[PDB]
Amino acid sequence: SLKTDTEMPYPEVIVDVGRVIFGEENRKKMTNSCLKRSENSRIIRAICALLNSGGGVIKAEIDDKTYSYQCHGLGQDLETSFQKLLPSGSQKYLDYMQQGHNLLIFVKSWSPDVFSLPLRICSLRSNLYRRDVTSAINLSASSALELLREKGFRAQRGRPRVKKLHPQQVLNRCIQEEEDMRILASEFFKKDKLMYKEKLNFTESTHVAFKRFTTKKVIPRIKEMLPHYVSAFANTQGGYVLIGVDDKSKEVVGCKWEKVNPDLLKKEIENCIEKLPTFHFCCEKPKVNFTTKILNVYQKDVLDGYVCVIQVEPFCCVVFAEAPDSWIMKDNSVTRLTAEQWVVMMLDTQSGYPIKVHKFKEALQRHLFPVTQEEVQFKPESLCKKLFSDHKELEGLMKTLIHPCSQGIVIFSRSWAGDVGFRKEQNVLCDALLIAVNSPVVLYTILIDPNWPGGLEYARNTAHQLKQKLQTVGGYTGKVCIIPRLIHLSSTQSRPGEIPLRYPRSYRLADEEEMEDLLQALVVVSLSSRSLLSDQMGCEFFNLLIMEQSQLLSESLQKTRELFIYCFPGVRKTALAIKIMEKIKDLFHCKPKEILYVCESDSLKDFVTQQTTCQAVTRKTFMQGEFLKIKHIVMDETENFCSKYGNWYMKAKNITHPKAKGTGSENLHHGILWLFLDPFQIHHADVNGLPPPSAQFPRKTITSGIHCALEIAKVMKEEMKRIKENPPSNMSPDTLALFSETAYEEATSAQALPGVCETKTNLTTEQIANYVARKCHSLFQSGYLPKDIAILCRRGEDRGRYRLALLKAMELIETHRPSEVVFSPATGVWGSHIVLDSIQQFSGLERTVVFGLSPECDQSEEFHKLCFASRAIKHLYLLYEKRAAY
Amino acid sequence: SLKTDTEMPYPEVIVDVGRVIFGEENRKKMTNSCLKRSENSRIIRAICALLNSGGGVIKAEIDDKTYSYQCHGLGQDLETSFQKLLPSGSQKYLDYMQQGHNLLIFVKSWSPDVFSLPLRICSLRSNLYRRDVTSAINLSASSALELLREKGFRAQRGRPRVKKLHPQQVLNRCIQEEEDMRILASEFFKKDKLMYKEKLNFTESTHVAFKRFTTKKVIPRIKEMLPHYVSAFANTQGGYVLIGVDDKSKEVVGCKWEKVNPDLLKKEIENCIEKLPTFHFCCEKPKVNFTTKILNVYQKDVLDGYVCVIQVEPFCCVVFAEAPDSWIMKDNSVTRLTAEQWVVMMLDTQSGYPIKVHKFKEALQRHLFPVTQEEVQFKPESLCKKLFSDHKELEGLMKTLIHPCSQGIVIFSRSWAGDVGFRKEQNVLCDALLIAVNSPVVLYTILIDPNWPGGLEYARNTAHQLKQKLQTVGGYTGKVCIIPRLIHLSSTQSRPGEIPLRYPRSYRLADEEEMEDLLQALVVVSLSSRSLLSDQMGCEFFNLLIMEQSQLLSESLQKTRELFIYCFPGVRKTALAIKIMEKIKDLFHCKPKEILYVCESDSLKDFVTQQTTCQAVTRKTFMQGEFLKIKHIVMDETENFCSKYGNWYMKAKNITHPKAKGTGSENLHHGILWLFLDPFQIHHADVNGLPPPSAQFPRKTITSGIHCALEIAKVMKEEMKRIKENPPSNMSPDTLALFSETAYEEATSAQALPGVCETKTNLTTEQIANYVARKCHSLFQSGYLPKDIAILCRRGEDRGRYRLALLKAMELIETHRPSEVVFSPATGVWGSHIVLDSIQQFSGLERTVVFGLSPECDQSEEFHKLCFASRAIKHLYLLYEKRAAY
RNA sequence: CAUCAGCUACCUAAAGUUCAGGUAGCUGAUG
Ligand SMILES: [Zn+2]
Ligand SMILES: [Zn+2]
Secondary structure: OOOOOOOOOOOOOEEEEEEEOOOHHHHHOOOOHHHHHHHHHHHHHHHHHHHOOOOEEEEEEEOOOOOOHHHHOOOHHHHHHHHHHOOOOHHHOEEEEEEOOEEEEEEOOOOOOOOOOOOOOOOOOOOEEEEEOOEEEEOOHHHHHHHHHHHHHHHHOOOOOOOOOOOOOOOOOOOEEHHHHHHHHHHHHOOOEEEOOOEOOOOOEOOEEEEOOOOOOHHHHHHHHHHHHHHHHHHHOOEEEEEOEOOOOOEEOOEEOOOOOHHHHHHHHHHHHHOOOEEOOOOOOOOOOEEEEEEEEEEOOEEEEEEEEEEEOOOOOEEEOOOOOOEEEEOOEEEEOOHHHHHHHHOOOOOOOOHHHHHHHHHHHHHHOOOOOOOOEEEOHHHHHHHHHHOHHHHHHHHHHHOOOOOEEEEEEOOHHHHOOOOOOOOEEEEEEEEEOOOOEEEEEEEOOOOOOOHHHHHHHHHHHHHHHHHHOOOOOOOOOEEEEEEEOOOOOOOOOOOOOOOOHHHOOOOHHHHHHHHHHHHHHHHOOOOHHHHHHHHHHHHHHHHHHHHHHHOOOOOOOEEEEEEOOOOOHHHHHHHHHHHHHHHHOOOHHHEEEEEOOHHHHHHHHHHOOOEEEEHHHHHHOOOOOOOEEEEOOHHHOOOOOOOHHHHHHHHHOOOOOOOOOOOOOOOOEEEEEOHHHOOOOOOOOOOOHHHOOOEEEEOOOOOOEHHHHHHHHHHHHHHHHOOOOOOOHHHHOOOOHHHHHHHHHHHOEOOEEEEEEEEOHHHHHHHHHHHHHHHHHOOOOHHHEEEEEOOHHHHHHHHHHHHHHHHHHOOOOOOOOOEEOOOOOOOOOEEEEEOOOOOOOOEEEEEEEEOOOOOOOOOHHHHHHHOEEEEEEEEEEOOOOO | OOOOOOOOOOOOOEEEEEEEOOOHHHHHHOOOHHHHHHHHHHHHHHHHHHHOOOOEEEEEEEOOOOOOHHHHOOOHHHHHHHHHHOOOOOOOOEEEEEEOOEEEEEEOOOOOOOOOOOOOOOOOEOOOEEEEOOEEEEOOHHHHHHHHHHHHHHHHOOOHHHOOOOOOOOOOOOEEEHHHHHHHHHHHHOOOEEEOOOEOOOOOOOOEEEEOOOOOOHHHHHHHHHHHHHHHHHHOOOEEEEEOEOOOOOEEOOEEOOOOOHHHHHHHHHHHHHOOOEEOOOOOOOOOOEEEEEEEEEOOOOEEEEEEEEEEOOOOOEEOOOOOEOEEEOOOOEEEOOHHHHHHHHHOOOOOOOHHHHHHHHHHHHHHOOOOOOOOEEEOHHHHHHHHHHOOOHHHHHHHHHOOOOOEEEEEEOOHHHHOOOOOOOOEEEEEEEEEOOOOEEEEEEEOOOOOOOHHHHHHHHHHHHHHHHHHOOOOOOOOOEEEEEEEOOOOOOOOOOOOOOOOHHHOOOOHHHHHHHHHHHHHHHHOOOOHHHHHHHHHHHHHHHHHHHHHHHHHHHOOOEEEEEEOOOOOHHHHHHHHHHHHHHHHOOOHHHEEEEEOOHHHHHHHHHHOOOEEEEHHHHHHOOOOOOOEEEEOOHHHOOOOOOOHHHHHHHHHOOOOOOOOOOOOOOOOEEEEEOHHHOOOOOOOOOOOHHHOOOEEEEOOOOOOEHHHHHHHHHHHHHHHHOOOOOOOOOHHHHOOHHHHHHHHHHHOEOOEEEEEEEEOHHHHHHHHHHHHHHHHHOOOOHHHEEEEEOOHHHHHHHHHHHHHHHHHHOOOOOOOOOEEOOOOOOOOOEEEEEOHHHOOOOEEEEEEEEOOOOOOOOOHHHHHHHOEEEEEEEEEEOOOOO
């Protein structure tokens, strides 16, 4: 929930930085430089925190009543800070607007695209130092990322032993190089005493730094200056810090013995180095390997001072001089990141990522949300019809609000808050999302009772969560503003608030490409969640997946003639078979009636002839007819076939691959004979008529066809594992050896979409009917159609009682509209009514929502759940009756 | 080549920058700022040119004879320039060394790795400007690359209808934002006259720049300052440049009428803008669109001055303020890149590039050049044996040269210059490349004659080209020095080097990991060359490819039982078959003797039975013998089988797929029956005995087995296409329609390695024999073994005459060593002799070098070239005969 | 909180394109 803010209530995280001087002239004439730096730091830290936490607004109070942003500007130091924070351009992330006595900085979230640097977060200073010749350089964010990746790569592989000290070698004199400085510094370090004003024969280098003591508080100044050099040396190659050496004259100076105590100085140096932040990519976690030594300075055997030399060894990993200058938002406060958190965020590579959704979002957007100059479109279709029939005035009111927009899309929802995974409000009738070119995105929240006090907060929160989901889940990397607007139906004429929310001009959708990008992000967001729009776009998404998978499978039409295709539960092989026949006709240039489809059930037969131009018959018709004109045969639900009516396999083999007795004919034809098999649903195991599993070659196992919900897929996976644990004696274990849970789980994570699957038990008939009627009413309120719901009973003798109870419950809930409730059998797929039939009659058919009603069958039958889940795409509701024992 | 350099003859590109002052105090005290800036610019341009051209050395003469790098360092301004040029650290690229009166800067080539930004070249300044609030920012190299990619991506996707009007913008009453300043600037631009010192109601912004006219030369100052603002505006969003407006006081100042001519000022502004460099990603290539306006200022109806306002519209792709501040080395000179060349190198994505070679380079290095502490090893073994037998003291002299190097690898070559694709020198006996830990890489060049004056130049050029190849082709991104040394065999009075070559200590192989990386780079370089070492590495590389491809193919053992495998020419199906038998034994857990391999030729059967533990017989033996214990059958060269001895296909099918009779046992066994087919190598094409092509299912086409030279694969591709143009009349062309030329070309590029394929025509027996003898002698000098060479005749009757001619030729040419040259038949492939037989007897067998001796068989047969190429791995020499008398 | 030495912009005198300076910015040292 966003923090309450009644004046300028933006649907963003708002950071109040207090009273700030603004304007180029006003900033320049500031006399208190400390206050100037304080104001600059507050604003820049807030910007960095907002850049790292999804964007937001910075609100600053303007002290000058005569200040005008048009005539005065921002300020040179503020702009310099912005350019330091955003070297790629602050225009892409910052916008400025003056609202009366406030100045607002609109911060867009830091989200790089593919064609840019792979920086995950923003930093002022990384505070990782690297030694470049004779300078300790505070690395930029990109430089720090390079260093982190190099250290991680080096430490991923181990370095045991490391006996590469190699005693010592011979030095060289005729040639001077940087290694000579390190050798000379090491010779200096092994000394124990120095003569006063002793000349040093070496200068600073990559491994040598020269420092001098101060004529003021000495230990605190060393504590400020040391971390930079220690970090720089440890990070690059190691080196020496020579405190007490004059840079220019190269003479030993040292600190006077009265002004410092060498033991205390040693302890302070050790303390400051020990507390330096560190990150390790290795497991041993070595500490910073350093050794400090005090060298007494003597003037004619008289103690005069000390020279402190610190040896810093190369570090295996990164060393921080302090915590990085990077900020995030935590509990509505700008919080500094620690070194450990900063490295973790900087090296993140997560940006659970759906490959297929982002691959097909463009096609889904071009199909479902086309950006055209063809008047404003109201989506989704079914929900809009229900809302407009429920309220006559709603449609005209929306057109009045939308005007004067000519091109755009308005996407309705029963609850947009619930659509994005947050709380549904009962007092909210619906939410409409207007998306148009050269317009801000507007979220209209229609209320039932205008006197409800939570409308403003609900709309603001919903707009905020939608934008956050679009940026994070949807991957939207643009400037978009969602304006929450509270609307009621009580007055046909509705007018906005006296303080309309305003955003910079850059926060509108500039063109059609930006509108298309936002709509593609919305496709991703909706597919990631649970709603009616998710279910409908999920059906379209599954169609695209079926098309690509069917293309891959048809590539085997030129490699095989006879093929046994083993399919896991829930792969949707009927759709695969339909597209395969399409490819057969295309490739073999045959007549559509030359391809034959053989299935076991008649409802599936009716469905297939309705969806294909090829000849489809049941196995009974296949055995009772003549098919001399058939060249190719595709078989489905072959596991339910029977040998009682003859050898269907021999007949199919003879048709597709006819042998010649006595040859004579030179036009022998070999045809396609593909059998789609599902070993996991082989029930009532009599003589199947199939050849033995040893002779079922060549074979193909289909693993990546699961087109159901994640919850439904997990139920089927659990059932498959349990079945494999205790396989029935009537099915061959060798066919079950081809199914692996790991491959099945990988396919589920690749394809399946979030859905609904719940179970309720110990319910009487009236309770089960009541649950189904209430849930169906709830689904119809959200925009679901009756053709999306199927109620399936385990046994066919329960149909009559269940139908009677369902009519009673549904008419009881429909006390306003006395319309007769129509149920249709499994053959009514083209119908727009709720399908009510048995699980065996619905074989090969699937619906978005399935209610499964069964008696108590604990350990009596272990197949019923698998069959129920195979007919459901998004919603599965398992209901179990009460065991009537008396 | 390399420019001659008597002093400091480094095998690098040396840039001489003349006399330069060095040292911190010397640079700081320098009074002539022009001379100081000039020296800094010269050095920094040389460094950038070397970073972009494979590295090199910079030589600067030191004017101060008392200067010492140990005690004076380099200088403040020089180090600052390095930090701008190399923001990621100059420690990884720059090394310094004083050598007498010269200071040397060693520049390592700029080569980004996986853990770095994808910057291809180094630049001081992109000179691409971007408007950040009220500043025109000269973008860095990384920022410029990001901007270039953004514009390239935007021009990749079409922006149609060019609706850049952006409706109309009006000023809001109470909201002030950055768009308001642009609107106010447009209103000011539309004005025609001004008032003297009249105030402005807007300030600078992203679209507004205020500039003042100068009280000096006006046109030069305008022409100097304008390109930055024009580039910045055209690159960000467009804007207005208001010349004549005071930024501090915000009134119109203007320039006096007597000081400039407005027509002249407009013309110079036009000329300046159209002279700006510009790069385009689009196709229209529009020019930079700008509009200049002169606003007269009138003070009481008196013409006082003029104000120039320039309006710039958002450019399509890119505008440069001037040529990019980046350099390369072109014709031994530091040359500034132009805008077009700079964008090309910046956007270059070339890193042909062998994917498989870089994948297998690590395994190849660990197998052929192991890095352990096992004393210095000599490679390659065959060439080393030849060299040490011909020169008795060579091994001892080499051993004393390496001393005291304990661990390392010496890689000999008859010509290392030839190995890297350059000119071989007959005056050079051999080159030995020493690679060792804690040591520089040394290239020893042994000369037969001490008095040859070209020895030093040859050694230096070879070292330079080898390092360049290692960096470019090999992908080596470390600091490595290849020190060229001249070595003399006969002269025992070994004169030491007058001027030893010195490199910074960072140019040694620091540890074992760097040694392995350098060796992997050398493996990549060798695999991209034509040499003996490349041929041996290619053999091992092809073995790894066979392992990978056989594993992929064995994945089908669980899916098929009978499989018709079609193999392209040059697929090496015998090696695939051998590994498949291993997998059959592994998977079905059967005895090795229960797997039967069937081929046609006796030589292939012999080769297979030494290569595998499974049973292997020919087709005649298979038909005659009894194999009731055989469970799986793999058949090779099935296209050559003969059906006059019976039905081998039916016999194989009954063994692998027996038919049950009398029922009783339900444990029928189904065995593997894999047939390897080569449709293009069917000679004497009678009834094969295979089933008709309509019944050869399931099938698999293999194209990813091409394991020969690029040239040999290209020859086979030509012959395959000519086969497809005029198909044979004894079989249906349906089988030959499964071989696509594009797939074969893709496979050849993916796997094949560079080699030799030469054709010679119109030669009598004596010329052919002499040519083969001279070629064999040349190969034997390079380290080729006699087991690498096979001489194959088209006609079996020519074997004796060719044998006599070849024996005479090699006895005539072997005047230095009377080795007994023995020719082995096609049954002695595993022997150490040269194979001399016919093409028919060598079927299924390969050798690295093949000599094909054929008569004038043009327009008589058409399989000869394909068959000869199928037997050659790296070298193919096709020789043709004339009409000789009896 | 001051001061100085180094890195682009802006400005004035000087000179046939040098030059003297001056200003606010960026970051090293001292106080
Ligand atoms: Zn570590
Ligand atoms: Zn363009």
